[PDB]
Amino acid sequence: EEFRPEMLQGKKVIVTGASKGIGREMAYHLSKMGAHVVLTARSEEGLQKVVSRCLELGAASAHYIAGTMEDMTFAEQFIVKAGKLMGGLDMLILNHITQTSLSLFHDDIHSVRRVMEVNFLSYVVMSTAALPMLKQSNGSIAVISSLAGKVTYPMVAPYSASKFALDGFFSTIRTELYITKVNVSITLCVLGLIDTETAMKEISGIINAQASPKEECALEIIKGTALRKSEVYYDKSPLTPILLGNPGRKIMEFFSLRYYNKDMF
Amino acid sequence: EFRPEMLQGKKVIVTGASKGIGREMAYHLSKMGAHVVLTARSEEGLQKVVSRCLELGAASAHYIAGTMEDMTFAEQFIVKAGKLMGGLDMLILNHITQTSLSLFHDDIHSVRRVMEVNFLSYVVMSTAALPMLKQSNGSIAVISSLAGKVTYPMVAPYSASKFALDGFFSTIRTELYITKVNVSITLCVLGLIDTETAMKEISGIINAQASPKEECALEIIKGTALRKSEVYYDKSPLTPILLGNPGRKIMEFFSLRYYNKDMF
Ligand SMILES: NC(=O)C1=CN([C@@H]2O[C@H](COP(=O)(O)OP(=O)(O)OC[C@H]3O[C@@H](n4cnc5c(N)ncnc54)[C@H](OP(=O)(O)O)[C@@H]3O)[C@@H](O)[C@H]2O)C=CC1
Ligand SMILES: NC(=O)C1=CN([C@@H]2O[C@H](COP(=O)(O)OP(=O)(O)OC[C@H]3O[C@@H](n4cnc5c(N)ncnc54)[C@H](OP(=O)(O)O)[C@@H]3O)[C@@H](O)[C@H]2O)C=CC1
Ligand SMILES: COc1ccccc1[C@@H]1N(c2cccc(S(C)(=O)=O)c2)C(=O)C1(C)C
Ligand SMILES: COc1ccccc1[C@@H]1N(c2cccc(S(C)(=O)=O)c2)C(=O)C1(C)C
């Protein structure tokens, strides 16, 4: 199977954290493809500027709804309004995250809660809210993760916890949808260091690593989701997907389905 | 090579000790002549286990009843327990919310509770306990599952939390290592265990052979004592091979050289 940019033409897409970074790039690529987009972030001004640009680039439609995704009530209402604006939903790109600084974890419990609320819990709310619309259209979900969601790094404990949680939850949901013959895809995008202004500011003085371009990154996510792939990998090193392949877990998960009573599906 | 003499006179906290694996760990530690402090919600349940612990030969045995849904309790529990024993050598994080096998359909409040009891309370307590573990060069046993390293259906919220534990506590281990803190973190990956809860809940759904809960408890204690990074325990002998994941260990080692050494 090969990606064609006509696959997203006319499709109704939602992009979280669309005001800047990879989300903003994803917004532009979808707009060039002639899709319907509803964007979100906290910054009202930031969204307005991106929505304007999306129209110029050639979006079928384009709207913004501003708010914080630490509010679960907002997260649920956002999906419902997004769906009302576009008349349905075809793709859900859960891309947003709460701010995190690189530091050794030290007596930082209220921060951990906040990270789980924004980086993980809201993802569950929005997927749950959006699922009925994605069932109706046989749609997709883009679950944007990290290398730190598969392997561990110092000075990023709460961030990893959340992204690991995303791998646990959405990999399970994916299987359930598959074994129950529900035609909705879930994509876990494992990303290496990307040259977004927030990331580069953060790794400054601490980490000495080469970043990858944010434009090309945004495109691969959109392609990977559109082609209904289980996982997508994006990193500078070509050794990454092989070292993060984990054939044992794949073997484990396949044979494990025989333990179950098929009557449950 | 482990010897049970090690744990004689040691000061161990065991969460979720009123039944299941935690109760069997409370018994084993008692047989080895340890000082235990046990905790669960059920007060009566803890009284029965503490009495049995004293019979079995515990250096001391106490309990503190309460829910780990509450983070205030979780924190105060460690301070109170630490005072009761006058120190802390080993922390066994074991408790979990009741799990039912079901295709995901829970609202956000159900999912939040799971993460608070299964994950968030583990972080609070570990954080709270750490100064004492630093003082005694102690250990932490974080009880995970195969559901924390692999995805099975009908257990989405459960997996989420166990994955979270790995993500979080693996990190803390490395941080403790690069900062030369002699406090060990053992992640115990367990397969199906013959507890009342597990066996009743898989009934009519999963046809699989369980492993004995008494041995399970011991292998957890042996690992944490010996300061292992991970303890694998499952019926199949192909399990620790399959869940080995050498690429991760390679990744994590080499990637330390990205960091500025002056940060530590
Ligand atoms: N860039 C990198 O080095 C890598 C990134 N990734 C992943 O890629 C994704 C995007 O990262 P990146 O683009 O760099 O992050 P950025 O900081 O560049 O952008 C994140 C977006 O999220 C929004 N946001 C921040 N806080 C909230 C919140 N409270 N509620 C709703 N939206 C919020 C921001 O807008 P606003 O502040 O106005 O609300 C912003 O548009 C993340 O999920 C990350 O985990 C993975 C590996 C590495
Ligand atoms: N049994 C199995 O097949 C498997 C078990 N495991 C792991 O082993 C560990 C123990 O499992 P197991 O012994 O079977 O579980 P059990 O249900 O048998 O025991 C759980 C313990 O935690 C306590 N508990 C339950 N809810 C709460 C809560 N809300 N707040 C505080 N305490 C609570 C219970 O006491 P009370 O209700 O009175 O509070 C009980 O003592 C878990 O971490 C589990 O993930 C891993 C793989 C397989
Ligand atoms: C060389 O790779 C790394 C080394 C140490 C730590 C982190 C990273 C990268 N990185 C990352 C870095 C800074 C900010 C953010 S952000 C915008 O999601 O908050 C994410 C990640 O994720 C990684 C793991 C891909
Ligand atoms: C053959 O093993 C399995 C197959 C599919 C799914 C799950 C399991 C087991 N399971 C488990 C099952 C029921 C109750 C609980 S409990 C007491 O922690 O709530 C835990 C686990 O964990 C496993 C993975 C060890």
The 3 state secondary structure assigned to B122-182 is HHHHHHHHHHHHHHHCCEEEEEEEHHHCCCCCCCHHHHHHHHHHHHHHHHHHHHHHHCCCC
Domains contained in chain A, CATH given = 1-265 (3.40.50.720)
What residue type is assigned to position B203 of the chain? S
Cα–Cα distance, B35 to B92 (Å, whole number): 13
Beta strands, E only, chain B: 11-15, 35-39, 60-63, 90-93, 139-145, 184-190, 230-233
Q: Which ligand lies nearest the alpha carbon of A209?
A: 3
Residue A234 neighbours by CB under 8 Å, 6+ apart: A189, A190, A191, A192, A194, A212, A217, A220, A221
Is the separation of the CB atoms in B58 and B29 below 8 Å? yes
Q: How far is CA B192 from the centre of its chain?
A: 15
Q: Is B206 on the interface with A (CB under 8 A)?
A: yes
Q: Are strands B184-190 and B35-39 parallel, antiparallel or unpaired?
A: unpaired
Nearest chain B residue to A126, by CA:
B108
Among the listed residues A91, A117, A111, the one whose alpha carbon sits nearest the alpha carbon of residue A39: A91
Extract the tokens encoding A39: 């964007």
Which residue in A180, A248, A253 is closest to B244 by CB distance? A248
Among the listed residues B175, B173, B148, B124, the one whose alpha carbon sits nearest the alpha carbon of residue B243: B148
Report how far ligand 3's centroid is from the alpha carbon of A21 (Å).
14
User: B12: which strand partners?
Assistant: B36, B90
Q: What contacts 24+ positions apart, CB below 8 Å, involve A78-86?
A: A78/A40, A78/A126, A79/A14, A79/A126, A79/A129, A79/A130, A80/A129, A81/A38, A82/A14, A82/A38, A82/A40, A83/A130, A83/A133, A85/A38, A85/A61, A86/A12, A86/A36, A86/A38, A86/A61
Chain B residues lying within 8 Å of A165, measured CB to CB? 115, 119, 160-161, 163-164, 167
Cα–Cα distance, B190 to B143 (Å, whole number): 8
- Testing the interface with A: which of B151, B181, B242, B245 to mutate, by most A Cβ within 10 A? B151
Residue A67 neighbours by CB under 8 Å, 6+ apart: A40, A42, A74, A78
Interface of B with A in 55-114 (CB under 8 A): 71, 103-104, 107-108, 111-112
* Helix orientation angle between A109-116 and B121-136, rounded to the nearest 10 degrees: 150
Among the listed residues A53, A50, A74, A77, the one whose alpha carbon sits nearest the alpha carbon of residue A64: A50
Task: Determine, for residues B103 and A180 on separate chains, whether the beta-carbon distance falls below 8 Å.
Answer: yes
A157 lines ligand 3 (CB under 6 A): no
Catalytic residue ranges of B: 158
In our burial notation (b when 16+ CB lie closer than 10 A, e otherwise), range A75-86 reads bbebbeebbebb
Task: Verify whether residue A153 is a known catalytic residue.
Answer: no
Q: Is B191 on the interface with A (CB under 8 A)?
A: no
Cα–Cα distance, A166 to B261 (Å, whole number): 31
Cα–Cα distance, B57 to B33 (Å, whole number): 6
Report how far ligand 3's centroid is from the alpha carbon of A199 (Å).
7
Nearest chain B residue to A241, by CA:
B247
Q: Is B209 on the interface with A (CB under 8 A)?
A: no
Cα–Cα distance, A232 to B75 (Å, whole number): 40
CA distances from B233 to A99, A110, B190, B213, B217 (A): 38, 34, 5, 11, 10
Resolution (A): 2.9
Q: Is B154 on the interface with A (CB under 8 A)?
A: yes
H and E: helices and strands count for chain A: 10, 7
Cα–Cα distance, B28 to B225 (Å, whole number): 13
Q: Which ligand lies nearest the alpha carbon of A195?
A: 1
Instruction: Given the residues A64, A123, A153, A159, select the one marked as catalytic.
Output: A159
Cα–Cα distance, A39 to A36 (Å, whole number): 10
SS3 content of chain A, % helix, strand, coil (to 5): 50, 15, 35
Q: Which ligand lies nearest the alpha carbon of A197?
A: 1
Q: Is A243 on the interface with B (CB under 8 A)?
A: yes
Mutate to test the pocket of ligand 4, among B97, B145, B190 (most ligand atoms within 8 A of CB): B145
Chain A residues lying within 8 Å of B168, measured CB to CB? 112, 157-158, 160-161, 164
Which residue in B112, B152, B245 is closest to A121 by CB distance? B112
